[PDB]
Design a protein around this ligand. Structure first.
Ligand SMILES: CC(=O)N[C@H]1[C@@H](OP(=O)(O)OP(=O)(O)OC[C@H]2O[C@@H](n3ccc(=O)[nH]c3=O)[C@H](O)[C@@H]2O)O[C@H](CO)[C@@H](O)[C@@H]1O
Ligand SMILES: CC(=O)N[C@H]1[C@@H](OP(=O)(O)OP(=O)(O)OC[C@H]2O[C@@H](n3ccc(=O)[nH]c3=O)[C@H](O)[C@@H]2O)O[C@H](CO)[C@@H](O)[C@@H]1O
Ligand SMILES: CC(=O)N[C@H]1[C@@H](OP(=O)(O)OP(=O)(O)OC[C@H]2O[C@@H](n3ccc(=O)[nH]c3=O)[C@H](O)[C@@H]2O)O[C@H](CO)[C@@H](O)[C@@H]1O
Ligand SMILES: CC(=O)N[C@H]1[C@@H](OP(=O)(O)OP(=O)(O)OC[C@H]2O[C@@H](n3ccc(=O)[nH]c3=O)[C@H](O)[C@@H]2O)O[C@H](CO)[C@@H](O)[C@@H]1O
Ligand SMILES: O=C(CO)[C@@H](O)[C@H](O)[C@H](O)COP(=O)(O)O
Ligand SMILES: O=C(CO)[C@@H](O)[C@H](O)[C@H](O)COP(=O)(O)O
Ligand SMILES: O=C(CO)[C@@H](O)[C@H](O)[C@H](O)COP(=O)(O)O
Ligand SMILES: O=C(CO)[C@@H](O)[C@H](O)[C@H](O)COP(=O)(O)O
Ligand code: NA
Ligand code: NA
Ligand code: NA
Ligand code: NA
Lengths: 341, 350, 339, 352
């Protein structure tokens, strides 16, 4: 009963998030098992550093999980846009583990980056959706994310499934640490609840439809403010708004230096986020605030819109925070007469 | 003779570039000596990775030099914005060399990041303009860039930082036979930089005309860049934002086919870096995409180059230098653009 | 009651082994806490490699524990004799952790080696018995082995306490590993029983006095055969016989190549090549002295010295004791004043 | 003309040393080129550490060149005996470069160690004489040392050819260093002279024959004292004496123990000391004085013209040309090969 494949795929996320984890997480014993990697983990872990390489929304899923990889593994992790990585002729060597994220497994720049790394003797790992695609075959090992086919022209469920697979990879790499056992358990217990929480967040759609019916839909640009874990969410929202809604958007690191969406969930509620919000409300700017259920980020003596989402484990919050942006980008396009498919 | 300190500081760059290099480069024998790091180089060469950490324009000078560091040293180099590095609580260890770049040597987020790295046992290196400032005192070793005071947003500090960082990369790679020719190339290039900066500064009249005829009334402008000139595009955007109080965004040229450029107005000001060092197919496609929609791009390119036709555009020509140095010349017209946009708006840039 | 200090210090080892562990191992919870290293462990784990540097018997305690360091930490471990390390001018860097083992903390080549590594920016760790000695002060961090003063001329209790301290250091480095938890616990429970097992091994003394009253004390050379964990023990037994008994001795890697002989044949190091070497000796009616675990029959004429079975990597602590007593009684029989 | 293949192989070393270097060293321009390692050098360097693994005399060739590998490359280098490496189950990983030195390419413990390292993801490099042997096939890359077939039961020319190949490997690894160029040129010019210097050393055979017919023949044991570069040579001399001459021998780190074996030796115990300038340490001189003070009459291997022991006190000298310090072992080993050979002939052993 969906208008477009994009809307269908947004609403499939409870199922795709569940399918990504299926048969890979023992939620009772708190054990992650990635069959595709299991013989390789000890080698993956013995590298000088990890380089995540991807394009577009897949590059965003790398940004969204970089912190949790560095936290859990204590291996340096850098995140590269495949085209820029190639542009700079970035040296890579036998001691590098290069992790390629791609829904299609066919993106030309990701393929060229893969071949470049392979030629230089690096160990390569694919986080891929299309089973047996080029990137899937040509990487040494990997995880098929099992999101199902993506027929929309923009990444929705691929993003949240990539992000989950990447978190499972980080957990897998760090499964031998006693000191990080509590953190592992917390994240694993949080993952179990994500699919039902995504269902809850999808219930924002009517509020989001009301917002996109407003003069929000005739704006020439929309800025998204975020920091920490939620900066990747800001960049991904802005990509979706440009690509889907044909509206200019920019994801801005909040407070570092027209409608505004600010991420103010607890995981990323920094003093600089508060002061950036306060700057907008000082000029009576009417921001749209994504925050956790029950938190009053702005008092009622300032006009603002709130989009409340469940609180999850800090490094998983982006899984839920992205959903309203996917929905906004979709409804803005529909109100603007755009066929998003 | 100058209306503002900012204008003085821009015009000072041939002299500040020369003073940054003074006593440090033997241009005849192609040898770089940085006294403050001399004895620490073998230790820096040895680390797991180099993390460059800075705020604002100093963060851009790190982006502008990341590639040549990687190329000359084959040591991994990442570039972190000080506040974001602290927000992610990025792990740092004894085997990291952390390089802190700061004009003032006093920026709170840079000092906080320094303290975090010191506490974790990392080796710390300062690239600082204010001698004996907190950052200078608290780093293990470093290079005072010797650019002189800034009373103006960073202009001569950016070029001097970028030069100091290039000198640092050359020092780290001074024992390599295979890199000897690339070293010589860059050092001979550096020798010519101060006079080429003098040359680029001659664009100011063309720039004042362009601001008076196409830019003053504008609300936003976009900068397109890729490779070595992506940092330049980010820095130009920051200058335009901070100095001129106009919206600006640096855009990775041609990365998105259906991104901002598929969205732009016909009259929106767009500056493209199209110097030979960063003249990628994706840069040409981006320019095309503007040119077909009847935008008239402002093309920064090398002297004599014909980047586009028939097709209406403004050209700002700059001398060709070594690829990894071209950003030193390319930033200068953006400094001048941002300055003139601001004064034509009654804004006090000092 | 003891005839010599060396004899007293051998017999003191149940107590010095306990004292070395005292306040540092929780045996019910299987937790090792070394207060000297507490805040430095995370840095030591980070390094490119560990270099253990020492002289004489202290060099042997590094060979004796190299394998367990490697096994538990997965960090490359090399073992260097201080003088030879200096002789090769072996390069050292910021990313090396250099571990210095010294009873006295004053040995000239060990000091010169420490100063060399310090100048080169390495992280330095001392395993030292004399509190506040040069090596204790000048290392960045370390563990005082708490063996008490050594008055005897040769290292006895210092060897076994060094070896225990080094094992505790390996356990501390690997205390964050889930996969090594089982092995950790095994080694910790083993360590708990070491002092009482040393008491038991000391009861071999009469058997060893009988052996040293024989024509064994009139021999020109004594060969010690070992492999694996027990190769260090063979080297240390050879050193003791030369230095105390004034009898030539060599520790030989058993059966590597194609006269009294002592063979280490405890279960931890009972390789095919050891059994082959032993069979070569018996085939020529050589009459070996076999050190082996209580109840084991290694050969069906020979002398057997039985020692309790402990965890493989701790067996060296018990196997060295009969060599200490053999070297001591051979000396007494040969009229040498060991003190 | 030779009595035995072993004698032939010893006297063949000028030719085998030349053949190992042939087509690999430009002595004019000081360039080392090892085709087998060509495009692997940048990868070999990019490692946490180098592990040299071998058995018997091949393990000695690794000990003899460890110091120069460490000096030229600044990569950690450890040397392991293949059987002991296996006994310890020493952990090996993807970031290790494991270098296997083997004349035959078929020694069981070296092959087992290789399989262990291969399955753990390490990069493996063979320094092998028998072309297409198991070790040569199974390593990722390597250098065939080109010594020619070795028919004698004990390694002679394979030792000096292995040692030379390992030095060439060390030079290849460090060929991009400006600060190393002078040391590289010094060693390469040294190497060019080694074949003719080996011929000079072989002129010692008459003196050695005489010595092996002496009161030396009747003794049951021989100690060798060495330090630094020449410790490997002392160990290799001891192996040759044990394995060929069937006499007890031990190589001793000279002057390490003030009251070790040297305080126990009989007046007439045969002792060879290496006292060439590259390894002429104060402790070596101390060890030598300890022997002569007890009326021992040592055999001194020293450089042409050097007076290590006063002519007042009764000692034998075997003089060898001086070469670059890290190459002196190539010359110092020759008299031990000849001594082991003639001791054996004088005792009736068939060395073949
Ligand atoms: C593709 C396939 O047959 N998967 C099977 C696999 O799933 P399982 O989840 O174990 O494995 P994946 O589908 O993730 O990976 C399949 C293989 O492809 C490799 N790989 C994967 C992605 C990538 O980008 N690069 C890459 O090299 C992996 O290393 C692995 O060898 O076992 C399950 C039974 O337990 C089956 O239900 C799945 O049908
Ligand atoms: C401060 C000083 O006397 N500098 C002198 C020094 O300059 P030189 O250029 O050699 O050294 P710098 O001024 O760059 O640095 C001075 C000291 O500060 C340290 N440092 C520097 C910057 C930093 O951020 N952190 C930090 O720790 C350096 O390691 C060094 O120990 O020799 C020159 C002659 O060749 C003189 O003309 C300079 O006046
Ligand atoms: C010397 C000292 O006062 N030790 C005290 C310490 O023992 P504890 O066992 O905690 O500490 P150690 O005696 O092993 O070491 C003391 C200090 O010396 C350093 N160190 C040690 C050896 C070495 O070779 N190099 C080196 O630098 C350590 O890093 C530490 O800072 O706390 C105990 C109470 O909890 C006290 O009973 C001990 O008296
Ligand atoms: C055996 C062979 O055909 N050698 C040829 C090789 O000599 P060149 O000296 O170049 O190479 P080597 O004989 O040393 O090595 C031959 C091949 O075997 C490999 N390798 C070698 C030893 C080892 O232990 N492991 C191992 O994998 C090498 O990486 C190489 O691929 O090219 C020359 C052309 O210039 C020819 O004159 C030689 O006839
Ligand atoms: O779908 C989008 C955005 O909604 C594109 O940005 C892709 O994310 C990018 O082209 C990478 O594609 P894959 O490599 O993941 O197939
Ligand atoms: O001047 C500017 C931009 O022109 C500021 O954004 C500074 O670059 C930033 O505040 C860092 O300052 P320093 O740490 O380099 O002193
Ligand atoms: O005692 C012995 C042997 O029984 C000597 O070999 C010492 O072991 C050596 O002199 C190092 O002494 P320390 O550095 O441990 O004090
Ligand atoms: O030759 C001898 C002694 O002269 C043996 O010690 C071999 O050196 C050893 O068996 C290794 O054999 P290879 O691996 O080099 O073929
Ligand atoms: Na694959
Ligand atoms: Na300083
Ligand atoms: Na200390
Ligand atoms: Na091969």
């Amino acid at each position: 009963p969906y208008k477009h494949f994009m809307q269908k795929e947004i609403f499939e996320q409870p199922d795709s998030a569940f399918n990504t984890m299926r048969g890979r997480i023992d939620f009772e014993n708190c054990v992650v098992t990635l069959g595709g990697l299991k013989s390789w983990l000890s080698t993956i872990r013995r590298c000088r550093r990890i380089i995540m390489i991807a394009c577009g929304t897949s590059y965003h899923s790398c940004l969204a999980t970089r912190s949790i990889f560095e936290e859990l593994t204590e291996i340096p992790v850098s995140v590269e846009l495949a085209s820029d990585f190639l542009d700079r002729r970035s040296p890579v060597f036998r001691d590098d583990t290069c992790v390629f994220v791609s829904q299609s497994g066919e993106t030309a720049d990701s393929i060229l980056a893969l071949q470049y790394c392979l030629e230089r003797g690096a160990l390569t790992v694919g986080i891929v959706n299309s089973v047996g695609s080029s990137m899937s075959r040509q990487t040494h090992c990997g995880v098929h994310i099992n999101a199902g086919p993506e027929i929309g022209v923009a990444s929705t469920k691929a993003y949240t499934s990539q992000y989950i697979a990447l978190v499972m990879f980080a957990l897998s790499l760090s499964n031998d640490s006693i000191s990080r056992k509590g953190r592992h358990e917390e994240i694993i217990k949080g993952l179990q609840k994500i699919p039902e929480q995504i269902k809850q967040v999808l219930k924002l759609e009517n509020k989001i439809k009301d917002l996109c019916n407003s003069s929000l839909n005739d704006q020439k640009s929309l800025l998204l403010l975020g920091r920490g874990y939620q900066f990747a969410t800001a960049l991904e929202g802005a990509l979706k708004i440009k690509e889907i809604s044909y509206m200019h958007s920019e994801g801005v690191l909040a407070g570092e230096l027209l409608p505004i969406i600010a991420f103010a969930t607890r995981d990323s509620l920094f003093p600089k986020v508060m002061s950036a919000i306060e700057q907008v409300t000082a000029r009576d700017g009417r921001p749209i605030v994504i925050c956790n259920e029950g938190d009053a980020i702005i008092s009622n003596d300032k006009v603002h819109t709130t989009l409340e989402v469940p609180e999850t484990v800090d490094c998983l919050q982006g899984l839920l925070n992205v959903i309203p942006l996917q929905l906004i980008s979709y409804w803005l396009a529909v109100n603007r007469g755009i066929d998003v498919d």
